[PDB]
């Protein structure tokens, strides 16, 4: 026996593909623990999830647990340095985050595998003896104020909080979880609250061991990890806090049959239908709400959405279960509305009820359940291995819900068929407890309530009894048929044997006028899956704003037309991505290799013989006008958008595209497609469970389909242009300034252009980014608290690179001078660090760059960047890392002095300032007169362009 451990669980059920090794257990103080041993992992990780969150905030200090969660990162009795924790991680290739939901607070990090204990020890102190320092608390309260600021003007957050504002206001559900400066400082001061005590009190009340789950993943054996967890976590105190429950639904009688008309920020049109339901978590072995979500949310022939779409009322639908908290849940059905749709809310809902009646009428269907069960069994068998940090974070939360032995499978494996539960839930999707919300600009002016926390304008009505009646009498509508057997369900899982000529990187196995094929058989993951990626180049996708619009519209219209047939493939784990790029088009097809040729074929064939529905065209066109307009409401950090336009040779503005959009007529589109398709080049990466012969074959089928149906011919080597980047003058500085009309913050992007990419240029910039990475966060946010969003790092585009800084702030772009201030802090800091501190940073970047991909598509993505950027440097990580180890402090000081210091002979600075809707401290250096960019075209015309990088 062991006193510290209440038990060890039995064998923890894992997929037989999972080579990782597992032990669950429960400590004497009640923490549920999963241990994960992966002797091959590069980074180790842990997470702790406390079953407490904002639903438990004092009614009089909204946001206290979100705030607590910020405060734990800022010092404890054992590690009092304010940023000890984020600094330790940073020097050891890790990072860390945390989130607070209504019932949970989840904290996770990763780190170099050699430093689990160091990281883990620092982390445990969050749960033992946080300082909540007086002065930290004063600063950090601004960061939370900024998180909320950011959300104020966003349609999702306003809807999310509005839902809670309109249930029982007595119910914890109507609390405001983010908090802000007002609720967390101003008003508590007005009321004589000592927030440091309130944090100490709440931590002390609720951070009990009996409400915690911890997961720890590392190279150590299961025994070693056990000792480690026992040692750092046994001492967490147990206060037997009863777990909070909410058996009473926040929506009672008077909340049902309500209609809400809401004014959005963006020009969007949506309908939200919602029914209150009991908590279904406990029925996870059968999962009735998933079953029904699958049916009502179906998109195949026969489906609810098929008809709403055919009547030109909705374009997309989502349905199924939505969590509330322990005690109450929701079932939703939500749709976007066309303009016609907006005038037929009533009929759309009646269709929803007609579709629900059809389910009552046909009863529960075991064959549907069997499909859901097989698909999840297979998903489970062959799940991609996860990145440690997400994985620990996830298991940590679900340890609160499932037996130890089941945590890994609980959410996949279905067991039990439950015509009773399916029928019970189905008996709640009735007009007598429906809630209806319509979001539309047409309610501008018409409304009379204002939600307090966000300012959302809305109106509230009883749904008229006569309407409830008509919905109550919905009869079968023969447009609605359950779906049929799903023919895309895969059945061939054989992993083809590894070829004698297979290679560790992709091999160019086809190099023709028409196509360039890169290919690799998977030699690492051994799952039955593959990725097939294609760039199609046509100079016409982007020749001008109008072509650009057309490429875009074409591809949307296509996807819209494939949707019904493609949906089944997607439930079966076969999916695809298809969009227009500044060069032409991008197609990715991913999932189980088994039926993939079928899907690829149907796509290219549709692409090449497409016929457009006039009605569909008109709808999609209108959604896209709105989409362009709505950009006006994106967040001020937009600064990135304008830099991207200022720095790239060719790029059309959202304004230009919008103008050109009225000239897009049906006749004009039909004409464009054959035009676009007539000369292409294709560069493909085929990668996964496939042979060279299969790959050549798949490539050639794409080619032949295009030739047959669209007479495609090759492009000339020269028309395969890449675009270039603007070359900034030595010693100059340009500012381009604009206003965000919607949000009341600023944003700024500051770019220090350095030089072309290459081994040495790259690694100089990367080491530098690594050394300044947590310091910038720590100074510009944590100390100076200039905004929530504060980012810094390398910028790469068009083969050039530089250092950038992005901040969203309430102070004006001021921001500049503080970054410049910071920049000097850093030279001096680089001078003052020990060699060993220098070399740890090298080591840390090295671990980051060499971290091996855990799954097929992570490996695909690295290769695809080498290909789409035409560097083709597949072994860049070893090369660049070898060179990295070479570098010294002098190199970095020289580099900084040459390209980055305020008086550097090759400084190249551009700043985008986005002003707000209205518009101790280190010493900021004096700055030059900037040059104000007046006009984007001119600014480009008056400067050189860089060369493009040479291939590998």
């Amino acid at each position: 026996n062991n006193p510290a451990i209440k038990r060890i669980g039995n064998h923890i059920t894992k997929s037989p593909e999972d080579k990782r090794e597992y032990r669950g257990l429960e400590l004497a103080n009640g923490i549920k623990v999963l241990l994960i041993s992966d002797p091959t992992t590069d980074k180790s990780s842990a997470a702790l999830d406390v079953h407490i969150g904002s639903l438990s905030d004092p009614p009089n200090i909204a946001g206290l647990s979100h705030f607590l969660q910020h405060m734990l990162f800022l010092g404890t009795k054992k590690y009092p340095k304010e940023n000890e924790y984020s600094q330790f991680l940073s020097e050891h290739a890790g990072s860390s985050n945390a989130f607070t939901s209504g019932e949970h607070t989840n904290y996770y990090f990763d780190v170099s595998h050699e430093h689990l204990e160091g990281a883990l020890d620092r982390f445990a102190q969050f749960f033992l003896s946080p300082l909540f320092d007086e002065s930290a608390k004063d600063r950090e309260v601004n960061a939370v104020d900024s998180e909320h600021e950011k959300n104020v003007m966003n349609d999702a957050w306003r809807l999310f909080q509005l839902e809670k504002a309109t249930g029982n206001p007595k119910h914890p559900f109507s609390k405001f979880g983010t908090g802000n400066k007002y609720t967390l400082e101003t008003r508590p001061n007005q009321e004589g609250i000592d927030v440091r005590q309130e944090l100490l009190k709440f931590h002390s009340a609720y951070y009990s061991s009996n409400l915690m789950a911890v997961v720890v993943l590392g190279r150590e054996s299961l025994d070693d990890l056990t000792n480690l967890v026992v040692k750092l976590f046994s001492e967490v105190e147990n206060k037997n806090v009863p777990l909070p429950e909410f058996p009473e639904h926040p929506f009672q009688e008077e909340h049902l049959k309500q209609l809400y008309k809401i004014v959005p920020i963006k020009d969007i049109r949506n309908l939200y239908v919602t029914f209150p339901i009991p908590d279904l978590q406990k029925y996870y072995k059968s999962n009735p709400g998933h079953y029904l979500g699958h049916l009502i949310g179906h998109e195949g022939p026969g489906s609810l959405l098929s008809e709403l779409k055919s009547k030109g009322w909705v374009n997309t639908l989502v349905g199924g279960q939505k969590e509330g908290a322990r005690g109450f849940m929701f079932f939703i059905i939500n749709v976007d509305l066309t303009e016609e749709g907006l005038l037929h809310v009533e009929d759309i809902i009646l269709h929803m009820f007609q579709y629900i009646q059809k389910l009552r009428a046909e009863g529960p269907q075991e064959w549907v359940f069997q499909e859901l069960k097989d698909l999840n069994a297979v998903a489970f068998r062959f799940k991609d291995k996860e990145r440690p940090r997400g994985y620990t974070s996830k298991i940590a939360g679900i340890l609160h819900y499932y037996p130890l032995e089941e945590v890994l499978t609980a959410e996949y494996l279905l067991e039990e068929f439950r015509p009773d539960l399916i029928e019970m839930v189905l008996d709640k999707l009735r007009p007598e407890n429906v809630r209806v919300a319509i979001v539309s600009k047409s309610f501008e002016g018409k409304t009379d309530r204002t939600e307090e926390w966000y300012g959302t304008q809305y109106k509230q009505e009883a749904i008229p009894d006569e309407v409830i009646k008509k919905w109550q009498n919905a009869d079968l509508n023969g447009k609605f048929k359950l779906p049929t057997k799903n023919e895309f369900i895969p059945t061939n899982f054989e992993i083809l044997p590894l070829e004698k000529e297979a290679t560790p990187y992709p091999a160019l196995i086809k190099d023709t006028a028409m196509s360039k094929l890169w290919f690799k058989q998977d030699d690492k993951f051994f799952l039955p899956k593959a990725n097939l990626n294609f760039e199609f180049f046509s100079p016409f996708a982007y020749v001008d704003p109008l072509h650009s619009n057309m490429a875009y519209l074409y591809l949307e219209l296509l996807k819209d037309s494939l949707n019904e047939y493609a949906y089944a493939a997607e439930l079966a784990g076969l999916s695809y991505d298809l969009q227009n790029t500044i060069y032409g088009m991008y197609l990715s097809v991913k999932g189980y290799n088994d039926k993939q040729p079928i899907l690829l074929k149907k796509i290219i064939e549709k692409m090449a013989t497409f016929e457009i529905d006039e009605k569909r065209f008109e709808i999609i066109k209108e959604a896209y006008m709105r989409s362009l307009n709505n950009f006006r409401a994106e967040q001020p950090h937009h600064a990135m958008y304008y830099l991207r336009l200022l720095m790239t040779e060719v790029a059309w503005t959202k304004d230009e595209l919008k103008e050109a959009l009225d000239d897009v007529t049906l006749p004009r589109l039909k004409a464009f497609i054959p035009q676009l398709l007539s000369r292409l080049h294709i560069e493909a990466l085929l990668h996964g469970n496939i042979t060279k012969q299969a790959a050549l074959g798949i490539m050639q089928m794409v080619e032949d389909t295009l030739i047959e149906h669209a007479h495609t011919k090759p492009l000339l080597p020269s028309q395969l242009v890449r675009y270039r980047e603007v070359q900034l003058p030595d010693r100059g500085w340009f500012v381009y300034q604009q206003r965000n009309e919607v949000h009341n913050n600023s944003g700024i992007e500051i770019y220090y252009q350095t030089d072309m990419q290459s081994t040495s240029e790259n690694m100089f910039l990367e080491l530098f980014a690594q050394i300044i990475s947590e310091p910038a966060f720590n100074t510009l946010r944590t100390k100076e608290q200039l905004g929530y969003i504060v980012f810094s790092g390398p910028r790469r585009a068009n083969g050039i690179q530089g250092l950038r800084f992005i901040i969203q702030s309430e102070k004006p772009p001021y921001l500049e001078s503080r970054v410049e201030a910071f920049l000097i802090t850093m030279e001096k800091s680089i001078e003052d660090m020990t060699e060993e501190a220098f070399q740890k940073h090298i080591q840390a970047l090295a671990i980051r760059r060499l971290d091996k991909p855990k799954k097929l598509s992570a490996e695909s993505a690295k290769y695809w960047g080498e290909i789409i950027s035409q560097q083709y440097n597949f072994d860049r990580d070893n090369t660049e890392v070898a060179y990295l180890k070479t570098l010294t402090k002098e190199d970095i000081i020289k580099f900084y002095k040459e390209m980055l210091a305020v008086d550097a002979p090759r400084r190249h600075k551009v700043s985008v300032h986005v002003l707000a809707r209205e518009m101790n401290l280190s010493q900021a250096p004096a700055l030059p007169q900037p040059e104000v960019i007046q006009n984007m075209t001119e600014f480009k015309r008056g400067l050189p362009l860089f060369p493009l990088v040479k291939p590998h």
């Binding site: 979100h66 969660q69 985050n97 945390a98 989130f99 607070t100 939901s101 998180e147 959300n151 966003n154 349609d155 999702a156 957050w157 809807l159 999310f160 979880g177 983010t178 969007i268 949506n270 997309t316 639908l317 989502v318 939505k322 969590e323 939703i332 939500n334 976007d336 994106e634 967040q635 990135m640």
Partner: peptide, 20 residues
């Protein structure tokens, strides 16, 4: 970090804001 239920076109939109 707070954040809330990402449904349909709210996940597409919200997830653009995380990824420049």
């Amino acid at each position: 970090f707070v954040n809330q239920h990402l449904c349909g076109s709210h996940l597409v939109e919200a997830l653009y804001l995380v990824c420049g």
